Design a protein around this nucleic acid. Structure first.
Ligand SMILES: [Mg+2]
Ligand SMILES: [Mg+2]
Ligand SMILES: [Zn+2]
Lengths: 79, 228, 201, 19, 352, 50, 50, 249, 149, 87, 230
RNA sequence: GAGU
C-alpha cells in the first residue's frame, strides 16, 4: 500500500479508477472526519484509503451505496 | 569527555534462532567500531562444542560409499558438522551410534551420555534404505572455539593419525551468522548520531541475547589491562 | 496526441499477419518477440487444419508464446491499432499489453503520446551518445562472400541468373535472397545476394 | 480527457448527451 | 526563525507525501518519477542509483527539479501511477529499465567468478551462511571452487511453490549471493559467473515468477551487495593493467614494409592512386585487427600461471579486463586504444 | 584524502590522470625522504648528495 | 494509423459530401452505418495517406 | 603549488600580471603585508632619482565572479633580489608558479557506491585543514533617490524595527565595519517617501492600540539577501554635490 | 623515468599499494593505485545552485510565476515535461501545474487556504494567459468567442 | 466561466464596436507630471477603467461605499482595476 | 572459556610526538579486533586543548592587514590553530601576548600561566618587520574533543557578541596519525599469540600511555550498554 | 556559461 500499490490495483483493476476511489475516500476522512476501518498506525488518509481498498473494504459501488443510504435517511428525517 | 552512552532499544526476536537488535544513540563512528569488534568475537571467539572426529566401522575414507545408505560418507559428515551438542561436565566426549533397519537415522538414535544433551534430536544424520543395513559409528565431540578446519589440523597436529579416523571441520562457535547495519539516528539537536542494527542467528544452544552479553563481556575483560 | 484507449473490445475480426524477422543472419526479431502481448485475431491453429489450437480474443502471454515455439508456428494474424474499428480512439484488445505494466492496457490510457515519446527518445538521445563520446572511426563493410553454417538445400527467391563461360551461376537480378532449408523444410538462415554475384552451386 | 480524467470527462460527456 | 518544534512538524507532514523528481531533458514519461522524500541536512538532492538509467542521470554535476503534488488526487496520481517502484519496465520495449550498472555489476561479477583452487578449494559447506562465515573468517576466497548444499524453490504446475534440496558445485561467492536471491528462483541462475547481461535476466525472471514487491526488494539487495563487494575487491587502475602485446613492433614494421611495396608500385605508374589508397587502408585495417587480437589473447587468458598439480590456464583477473568483461565499464574497443593500436582516424570530410 | 571511482577511466581514455597520480606519489616519495632527512638533521653534505 | 486518418470521397453519399471532399474516415464510416440502416445513396470513398 | 606540472606554470603566473614582479634588482629595504620597498642596485640604479622602488600590494578585493583577489608578499625583509623575480604572489600562485588548486592523496577504488558516476568521496581531513576553503566577496548597494513625493532618507530611524537590528547600525544608519550579518539583518538604513493610503479598519484599530502611526517614508532599507551570511569588511559612501552629508559619511 | 623515480622513493613500480578499510581494519583484496592528483574546486558551489519555492511574485501579463533563483523563480514545466504527465495519465497533477500552481489567480489563493485548512481540495478555474490570448486575437480583428454549454 | 466549445469568425466593423468601451482619439499615454492617464488616450481611465480598485481618477468616489458610480467630474466608473486588462 | 588478558609491556617514546607501544600477549584474532576498534576511538573521541577565540587590538576582522606585519590576520589565526598547549588545572585559559621589535614572534613570547605549558616554544605565530611595530593579543584556549568549527559555534550561544573576537577552527583532537601492526610474539610455546605494536603520532603533550587508557575507557563504557542492559 |  505504501511502497507497492500492485495488490491495491489488483482489487479495483483500473489504476485510474483506483486513484479516483482512494481520493474520494481520503476526502471523506480529510473533511467529513469519516472513521477509518484499518488501524491507522500513524499513516496519512491517502495510505489508509489504499490499505482499505487492498483488503477490499472500499469500492466505487460500496461508496455510492453508503452515499444514498445516508442521504435518503436525512431526506426521511426532513420529511 | 562528554561520554554519550547508547541504550538497548529494541530486541525483535523473530525466532529463537534469528534475532534483530536496534541500538541507539551511538556517537559518530562508534556504530562500526562496536559493530565490527563484536562481530569478530561473536564469530571466531564464542566457545562451544562440535564433532572433531568420526569413526564408522567398514569405512576407510570419506569418499567411499556404504551399501544400504542413501548418503555418501561426505554428506553424512556434513550433517554431523551441523549437529548441535551440549556437553555439561567434560570438554571431550565420544558418543556411540548403532542403528539398523529402514529408517531416517536421527540424533535421538545416538546413545546419550549422562551429561550430554542433544539439542535437536530430530536432526537428520543418515538415511538407511536396505532393512538389512546396519550403521555403527563413534562421534568424537570436543569443546573449542571459532572454526578449526581439518586442513589446519592435519598440518599442525602430526602425532597419532591411524587409517580410519575421519577428520571433519570442527565448528566450535555456535553463532551461525552475524551482520551489523549502521543507519543514521535523529535527536532533538544532534543529527549526526548513528543506530546499530545487529542481526544474529545462533543454532539454539546459546541464546542470541545471552551470546551478545558474553561477547561484550570478553571485550571488556581485555580492557582490564588498560586500567580504566 | 488525441489517440486514447476508448473501448475494451471493438468487436473487429481484423489484424495484420506478422512473420518472423531474420535480418542479416542472427534472428533479430523472433515471431514470439514480435507478437508477444498482442491480441490474436481469428482462430489461428496448427498446420493441420482440423482442430482449433488457439482461440479468438486471447492476449499472447509468455506461456502461450512458449507453446508457439514447440508447435513451430509459421505466421500469425494479430490484432493491430490500424485495423481497430473504434472511432475516436482504439480498443484495449487491438493494442494489447501495456509493455510498461506487464498486463493488458487499461482503458483511458493516452497511447499516442506514449508512442511518439517511445519512437522519438532513442533518436534524440543517440544523437548525444555516440557524439560527445563519438571519436575513433571503426567502419566495417568487407562483405565479399557469404558462408553457410548449417547444412541444407540452397533455396533462392526472385532470382534470374545465367551460366557464364567460366562455368558458374552468375545472377542478373537486383533483389536476390538466399534461404537455408533444413531437413523437414523451414527457413533457418537468410542472406542478401547482390547483382552480378557468383554462386558456387 | 484521458488517464485520471477519463472518468470525469465521460461523466461530462453524458451530461452533454442528456442536455 | 526555524524553531526546533517546526522541524518536528515538517517531519510529520512529509511522511507518506510523494514528491516528483524531473531531469532535463524529459524524453519519455520515466523522466519524471515519484519518490517518498527522506529529509537530509545538506543542499543536494540524493537520487537512487538504479533509476539513474531512466533519467540518464550521471552525477558529474547534474541538477534535478522537484515538484510537490498538492491535492489528494495529485498525491495518489504520484503514488499509484508515477512512483518509481510502480514504473520499472520501458513503455517502448517490454524490458526492465531499472538495471544495476557500473560498481554493482563489478561487485557481483567479482563474487560469482571462480579461480583455480585459491583458498580452500574443494571444501564442503552446510549452508550459504557457513560460506559467508568462512569467507569473512579468512579461510576461503570468494573464488574457491567448493561444493555447497543449497535448497532452491521451483514453482509447480499450480500456485503452490515446490522446494527441492541438492548438492551444487558452486563457489563461496555464489553461495553468499544466494542469500540475496528470493525463494522461488532456481539456484542455477546465480551459479554462473554473473555479468550485466545475466543480472538483467535475473530481474526479468524474478518479475515474471514472483511479481513486483519481491523484485523491488531484490533489486535493492543486489545494489547493496554489489557495491559492498565492489569496495571489498580493492579494484583499481594502474598503468601496468594496460598490457601491450610483445609483438606490436614486428607487426607494425611488417605492415610498414608492405605499405612501402604499394608506394613503390605507384611510383612505377602501374597501380592507380585510388587502388593504392584502398590497398594501404586494407593492409592497416588487417594490421589493426591482428594487433587487437594479439592484445586480447595475451590479456584475456594471461593467467597461464596456476597450480595444484602443475601449470594450468585460466581467465585473467587484470582490472581493466574485469571491468570490460563484467559489462561494468569499457569494452574491447576501448581497450584497443589503451593497450593496442589506436587505429585509422577519419577526417572531417568523412574520408579516412 | 580522496577515493575516486576507477570505473571513470577505461571508457574515458584520460590516462593522464593515472600517470599524474603515479608521478605525484613519486614526487611526494622524494618529498617524504627529504622530510625524513631534515627531521633527523643529517647534514648539508648528505642532503646535497641525495 | 494517425497518418491514415483522412479519406477523399469520390462519388456522392446521401449527405452533402459529393465529389472530392476530404473527411475523417471515422465520420464517413459512422455515416455509412446510418446509410446501411436507411439505404439511400451509399458514399464511395478512398482512404488517403498523410 | 602543483607537484606534477609542465613548466608553463611560472610563465602563466608571471605574464598574467596578477603577481607583483620586480622592475629592478636589489635588496628589499622593507617588507609589509600592505607594501614592498626594494632598494635598487648601483649598476641598474639610475643616477637621477634616489632609486628605491615602492610596490603597494592590492589587498582583499572583489573579483567579477565574487571571488577574492589578494596579493601576499613572497620575499623576506632584507633579501637580495634579481630583476624580474616574483616579489608578491597573486591569488592562485605559489612562489611565482601557477597554483589553481591543491594536490592530494588519492586512491582509485570503488567504495559502497559513494563514488558511483564520478561521485567523489573526500576525507573530513581536507575540510578541517581548510585547504579547499574559498573566499567570496559580495557587493550590496543602497540608493537614496529623489521621488515625486520627496527625497528618501538614509536614517537609522525606521518604522517597526527591533533594537536588536538597530544595534548593528550606527547613528547615520550604516552597519559598522567588521559586523557579522545574516539574511534579513539591515545593512544601510534607507527608505523611500510614501503618500496617503486608505488604512484598513484593522490597521486603524491596531495603530490605535500601539499608537505608532505610519511615517512619511515607507520601508525599503537594504538588508542582507536571504540565506547569504558574511562579515562586513568595508563600506563606501557616494554623496552628490550639495546634499547634507551623513555623520557616518 | 617514473618507475625509476618511484624506486628512488622506495615506492612500488606498480604505484599500487596495500590499503586497509578504515572501518573494519581488514586489508582490501588487492593493491590499489594511490598517489597525488592535483585537484581543483570549480566555481560551481552548491550554495549558488540550490533553490526552492512554494509561492511568490507572479509575472506581469501571463500571471505565471517568474523564472530564475535571482527573481525567486518557479521551475518551468515545459511542453516535454507536460507530455510525461500525459503519458502517465496523471490528469490532476497536470491540471494543478497549469492552474492553481501558475495562472489561475482565484485558484491559487483558494487552494492555499485549503492547504492551511488541511483539506487538499482542487478548486480550479481558467488560466489568465488564455484570457489574454483571446484579447490578443480580437485585437487582430478576428472574432473568437466562447460558445457556452 | 465553464463553456462547451470555441468559435472563430471574421470580425464585423459592428462586432469590433461591441467589445469597445470607448474610442481612443489621441496618442497620449499619461501626463508627464501626474503619471495619470491622458483624456481619450491609449491608457484613458475614462475608457478602459480605474487604475486603482474602486477609485475614480480625481478621487471623488472611493471604496465600495460608491459601487457602480460614474464620476461626473472626471468621467471614470468606480470598479475593480482588474477591468483594465479586460475592456 | 580460556580467558587471557594482555598487559601493557613497552612504551618506546621515540619523540614527544611519536611513540610505539607494544602489547602482549593477545589471544589469536584479538590483535586486529582491539587494534582497529582502538584506532577508531583514538582518531575521533580523544580530548585535547585548542585556540577557540582570538582578540588582537586594532583588528576588527580576520580579513584585514596589520601594519608592520608580514602575515595577514588569517595566516596568523592558522598558526594559532597549530599552537601546541597543555593546560594542567583549568579547562579554559586566556593567554596574553605582547611583543614588539624586528622579530619572528614565537610561542615563547606568550606570557605563560602558572599551569599552562607551551609544548613547542619555537612555534612561529607572526613576523614583525617594522621595529616600531608592537602586537598585542589575547588567545583563548579551551579544552574539548574532535573538531569544533567556528561555523558550528556561530549558530548556538552568542549571548555576548563583542566586535573584535575572532572565531577560527580548533582541532582539539591530539592524534595526528595512528597505525597498529601485528608481529609474532614467541612467548612460551604458544607461537600463535602475537603482539599489538601501536605507533601513535600526536601533537604536543597528550601522553601516549594516558591516551591509550582513555581510549580503552570509552570502549568499556559503551560496552556497559551491551553487558548491563542485556 | 551548466548537464545532457
Ligand atoms: Mg559520468
Ligand atoms: Mg552528467
Ligand atoms: Zn472622478
Amino acid at each position: 500500500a505504501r511502497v507497492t500499490v500492485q495488490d491495491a490495483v489488483e482489487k479495483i483493476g483500473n489504476r485510474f479508477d483506483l486513484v479516483l476511489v482512494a481520493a474520494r475516500r481520503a476526502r471523506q476522512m480529510q473533511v467529513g472526519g469519516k472513521d477509518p476501518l484499518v488501524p491507522e498506525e500513524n499513516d496519512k488518509t491517502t495510505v489508509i484509503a489504499l490499505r482499505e481498498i487492498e483488503e477490499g473494504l472500499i469500492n466505487n459501488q460500496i461508496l455510492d451505496v453508503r452515499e444514498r443510504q445516508e442521504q435518503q435517511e436525512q431526506e426521511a428525517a426532513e420529511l | 569527555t562528554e561520554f554519550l552512552k547508547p541504550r538497548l532499544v529494541d530486541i525483535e526476536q523473530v525466532s529463537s534462532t534469528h534475532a534483530k537488535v536496534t541500538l541507539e544513540p551511538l556517537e559518530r563512528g562508534f556504530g562500526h567500531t562496536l559493530g565490527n569488534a563484536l562481530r569478530r568475537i561473536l564469530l571466531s571467539s564464542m566457545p562451544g562444542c562440535a564433532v572433531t572426529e568420526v569413526e564408522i566401522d567398514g569405512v576407510l575414507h570419506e569418499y567411499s560409499t556404504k551399501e544400504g545408505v542413501q548418503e555418501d560418507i561426505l554428506e553424512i559428515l556434513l550433517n554431523l558438522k551441523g549437529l548441535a551438542v551440549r556437553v555439561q561436565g567434560k570438554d571431550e566426549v565420544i558418543l556411540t551410534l548403532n542403528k539398523s533397519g529402514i529408517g531416517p537415522v536421527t540424533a535421538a538414535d545416538i546413545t546419550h551420555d549422562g551429561d550430554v544433551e542433544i539439542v535437536k534430536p530430530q536432526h537428520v544424520i543418515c538415511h538407511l534404505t536396505d532393512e538389512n543395513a546396519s550403521i555403527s559409528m563413534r562421534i568424537k565431540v570436543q569443546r573449542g572455539r571459532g572454526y578449526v578446519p581439518a586442513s589446519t589440523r592435519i598440518h599442525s597436529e602430526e602425532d597419532e593419525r591411524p587409517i580410519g579416523r575421519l577428520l571433519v571441520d570442527a565448528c566450535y562457535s555456535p553463532v551461525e551468522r552475524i551482520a551489523y547495519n549502521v543507519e543514521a539516528a535523529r535527536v532533538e539537536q544532534r543529527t549526526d548520531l548513528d543506530k546499530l542494527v545487529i542481526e544474529m542467528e545462533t543454532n539454539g544452544t546459546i541464546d542470541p541475547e545471552e551470546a551478545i552479553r558474553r561477547a561484550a563481556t570478553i571485550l571488556a575483560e581485555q580492557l582490564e589491562a588498560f586500567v580504566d | 496526441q488525441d489517440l486514447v484507449v476508448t473501448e475494451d473490445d471493438c468487436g473487429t475480426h481484423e489484424g495484420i499477419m506478422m512473420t518472423p524477422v531474420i535480418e542479416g543472419g542472427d534472428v533479430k526479431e523472433p515471431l514470439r518477440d514480435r507478437v508477444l502481448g498482442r491480441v490474436t485475431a481469428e482462430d489461428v491453429l496448427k498446420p493441420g487444419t482440423a482442430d482449433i489450437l488457439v482461440p479468438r480474443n486471447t492476449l499472447l502471454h509468455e506461456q502461450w508464446c512458449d507453446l508457439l515455439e514447440e508447435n513451430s508456428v509459421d505466421a500469425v494474424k494479430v490484432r493491430s491499432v490500424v485495423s481497430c474499428d473504434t472511432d475516436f480512439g482504439v480498443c484495449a484488445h487491438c493494442y494489447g499489453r501495456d509493455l510498461a505494466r506487464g498486463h493488458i492496457i487499461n482503458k483511458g490510457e493516452a497511447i499516442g503520446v506514449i508512442a511518439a515519446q517511445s519512437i522519438g527518445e532513442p533518436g534524440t538521445q543517440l544523437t548525444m551518445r555516440t557524439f560527445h563520446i563519438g571519436g575513433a572511426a571503426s567502419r566495417a563493410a568487407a562483405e565479399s562472400s557469404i558462408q553457410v553454417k548449417n547444412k541444407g538445400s540452397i533455396k533462392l527467391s526472385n532470382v534470374k541468373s545465367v551460366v557464364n563461360s567460366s562455368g558458374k551461376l552468375v545472377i542478373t537480378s537486383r533483389n536476390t535472397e538466399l534461404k537455408l532449408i533444413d531437413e523437414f523444410g523451414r527457413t533457418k538462415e537468410s542472406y542478401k545476394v547482390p547483382y552480378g554475384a557468383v554462386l558456387a552451386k | 480527457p484521458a488517464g485520471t480524467g477519463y472518468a470525469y470527462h465521460q461523466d461530462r460527456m453524458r451530461r452533454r448527451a442528456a442536455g | 526563525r526555524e524553531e526546533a518544534v517546526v522541524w518536528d512538524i515538517l517531519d510529520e507532514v512529509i511522511r507518506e507525501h510523494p514528491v516528483l523528481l524531473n531531469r532535463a531533458p524529459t524524453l519519455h514519461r520515466l523522466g519524471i518519477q515519484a519518490f517518498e522524500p527522506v529529509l537530509i541536512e545538506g543542499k543536494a538532492i540524493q537520487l537512487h542509483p538504479l533509476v539513474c538509467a531512466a533519467y540518464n542521470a550521471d552525477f558529474d554535476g547534474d541538477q534535478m527539479a522537484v515538484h510537490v503534488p498538492l491535492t489528494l488526487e495529485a498525491q495518489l496520481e504520484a503514488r499509484a501511477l508515477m512512483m518509481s517502484t510502480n514504473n520499472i519496465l520501458s513503455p517502448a520495449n517490454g524490458e526492465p529499465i531499472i538495471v544495476p550498472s557500473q560498481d554493482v555489476v563489478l561487485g557481483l561479477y567479482y563474487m560469482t567468478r571462480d579461480c583455480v583452487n585459491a583458498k580452500g578449494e574443494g571444501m564442503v559447506l552446510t549452508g550459504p551462511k557457513e560460506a559467508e562465515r568462512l569467507y569473512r573468517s579468512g579461510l576461503a576466497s570468494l573464488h574457491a571452487r567448493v561444493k555447497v548444499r543449497i535448497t532452491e524453490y521451483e514453482k509447480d504446475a499450480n500456485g503452490e511453490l515446490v522446494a527441492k534440496t541438492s548438492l551444487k558445485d558452486t563457489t563461496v561467492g555464489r553461495a553468499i549471493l544466494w542469500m540475496i536471491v528470493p525463494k522461488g528462483l532456481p539456484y542455477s541462475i546465480v551459479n554462473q559467473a554473473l555479468g550485466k547481461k545475466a543480472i538483467s535476466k535475473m530481474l526479468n525472471t524474478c518479475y515474471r515468477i514472483l511479481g513486483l514487491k519481491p523484485t523491488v526488494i531484490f533489486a535493492d539487495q543486489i545494489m547493496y551487495t554489489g557495491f559492498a563487494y565492489a569496495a571489498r575487491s580493492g579494484a583499481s587502475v594502474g598503468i601496468d593493467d594496460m598490457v601491450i602485446p610483445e609483438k606490436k613492433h614486428e607487426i607494425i614494421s611488417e605492415a610498414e614494409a608492405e605499405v612501402a611495396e604499394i608506394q613503390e608500385q605507384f611510383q612505377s605508374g602501374l597501380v592507380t592512386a585510388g587502388e593504392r589508397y584502398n590497398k594501404v587502408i586494407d593492409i592497416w585495417a588487417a594490421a589493426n585487427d591482428r594487433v587487437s587480437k594479439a592484445m586480447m589473447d595475451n590479456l584475456q587468458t594471461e593467467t597461464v600461471i596456476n597450480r595444484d598439480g602443475q601449470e594450468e590456464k585460466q581467465v585473467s583477473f587484470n582490472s581493466i579486463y574485469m571491468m570490460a568483461d563484467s559489462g561494468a565499464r569499457g569494452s574491447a574497443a576501448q581497450i584497443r586504444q589503451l593497450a593496442g593500436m589506436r587505429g585509422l582516424m577519419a577526417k572531417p570530410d568523412g574520408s579516412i | 584524502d580522496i577515493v575516486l571511482n576507477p570505473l571513470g577511466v577505461p571508457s574515458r581514455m584520460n590516462i593522464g590522470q593515472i600517470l599524474e597520480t603515479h608521478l605525484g606519489m613519486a614526487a611526494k616519495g622524494i618529498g617524504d625522504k627529504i622530510n625524513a632527512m631534515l627531521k633527523q638533521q643529517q647534514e648539508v653534505a648528505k642532503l646535497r648528495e641525495f | 494509423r494517425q497518418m491514415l486518418r483522412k479519406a477523399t470521397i469520390v462519388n456522392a453519399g446521401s449527405s452533402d459530401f459529393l465529389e472530392g471532399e476530404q473527411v475523417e474516415y471515422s465520420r464517413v464510416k459512422i455515416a455509412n452505418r446510418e446509410l446501411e440502416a436507411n439505404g439511400k445513396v451509399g458514399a464511395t470513398y478512398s482512404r488517403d495517406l498523410l | 603549488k602543483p607537484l606534477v606540472g609542465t613548466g608553463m606554470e611560472r610563465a602563466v603566473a608571471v605574464d598574467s600580471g596578477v603577481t607583483a614582479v620586480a622592475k629592478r634588482g636589489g635588496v628589499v629595504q622593507y617588507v609589509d603585508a600592505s607594501r614592498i620597498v626594494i632598494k635598487v642596485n648601483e649598476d641598474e640604479m639610475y643616477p637621477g632619482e634616489a632609486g628605491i622602488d615602492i610596490y603597494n600590494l592590492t589587498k582583499y578585493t572583489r573579483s567579477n565572479q565574487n571571488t577574492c583577489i589578494n596579493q601576499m608578499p613572497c620575499v623576506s625583509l632584507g633579501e637580495p633580489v634579481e630583476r624580474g623575480d616574483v616579489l608578491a604572489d597573486g591569488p592562485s600562485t605559489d612562489l611565482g608558479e601557477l597554483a589553481l588548486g591543491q594536490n592530494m592523496r588519492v586512491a582509485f577504488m570503488p567504495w559502497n557506491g559513494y563514488n558511483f558516476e564520478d561521485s567523489i568521496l573526500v576525507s573530513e581531513r581536507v575540510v578541517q585543514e581548510d585547504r579547499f576553503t574559498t573566499i567570496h566577496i559580495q557587493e550590496l548597494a543602497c540608493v537614496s533617490r529623489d521621488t515625486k513625493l520627496g527625497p528618501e532618507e538614509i536614517t537609522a530611524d525606521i518604522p517597526n524595527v527591533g533594537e536588536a537590528a538597530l544595534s548593528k547600525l550606527d547613528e547615520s544608519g550604516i552597519v559598522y565595519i567588521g559586523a557579522e550579518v545574516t539574511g534579513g539583518d539591515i545593512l544601510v538604513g534607507k527608505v523611500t517617501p510614501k503618500g496617503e493610503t486608505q488604512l484598513t479598519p484593522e490597521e486603524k484599530l491596531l495603530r490605535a492600540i500601539f499608537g505608532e502611526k505610519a511615517s512619511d517614508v515607507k520601508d525599503s532599507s537594504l538588508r542582507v539577501p536571504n540565506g547569504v551570511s558574511g562579515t562586513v569588511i568595508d563600506v563606501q559612501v557616494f554623496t552628490r554635490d550639495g546634499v547634507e552629508k551623513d555623520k557616518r559619511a | 623515468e617514473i618507475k625509476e623515480l618511484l624506486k628512488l622513493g622506495d615506492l612500488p613500480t606498480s604505484g599500487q599499494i596495500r590499503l586497509y578499510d578504515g572501518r573494519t581494519g581488514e586489508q582490501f583484496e588487492r593493491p590499489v593505485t594511490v598517489g597525488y592528483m592535483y585537484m581543483l574546486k570549480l566555481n560551481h558551489l552548491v550554495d549558488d545552485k540550490m533553490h526552492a519555492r512554494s509561492t511568490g511574485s507572479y509575472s506581469l501579463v501571463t500571471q505565471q510565476p517568474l523564472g530564475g533563483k535571482a527573481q525567486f523563480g518557479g521551475q518551468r514545466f515545459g511542453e516535454m515535461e507536460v507530455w510525461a504527465l500525459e503519458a502517465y495519465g496523471a490528469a490532476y497533477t497536470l491540471q494543478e501545474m497549469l492552474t492553481v500552481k501558475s495562472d489561475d489567480v482565484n485558484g491559487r489563493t483558494k487552494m492555499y487556504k485549503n492547504i492551511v485548512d488541511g483539506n487538499h481540495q482542487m478548486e480550479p478555474g481558467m488560466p489568465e494567459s488564455f484570457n489574454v490570448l483571446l484579447k490578443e486575437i480580437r485585437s487582430l480583428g478576428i472574432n473568437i468567442e466562447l460558445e457556452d454549454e | 466561466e465553464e463553456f462547451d466549445a470555441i468559435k472563430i469568425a471574421l470580425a464585423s466593423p459592428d462586432m469590433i464596436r461591441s467589445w469597445s468601451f470607448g474610442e481612443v482619439k489621441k496618442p497620449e499615454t499619461i501626463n508627464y507630471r501626474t503619471f495619470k492617464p491622458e483624456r481619450d488616450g491609449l491608457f484613458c481611465a475614462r475608457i478602459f477603467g480605474p487604475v486603482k480598485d474602486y477609485e475614480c481618477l480625481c478621487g471623488k468616489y472611493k471604496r465600495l461605499k460608491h459601487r457602480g458610480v460614474i464620476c461626473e467630474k472626471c468621467g471614470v466608473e468606480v470598479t475593480q482595476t482588474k477591468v483594465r486588462r479586460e475592456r
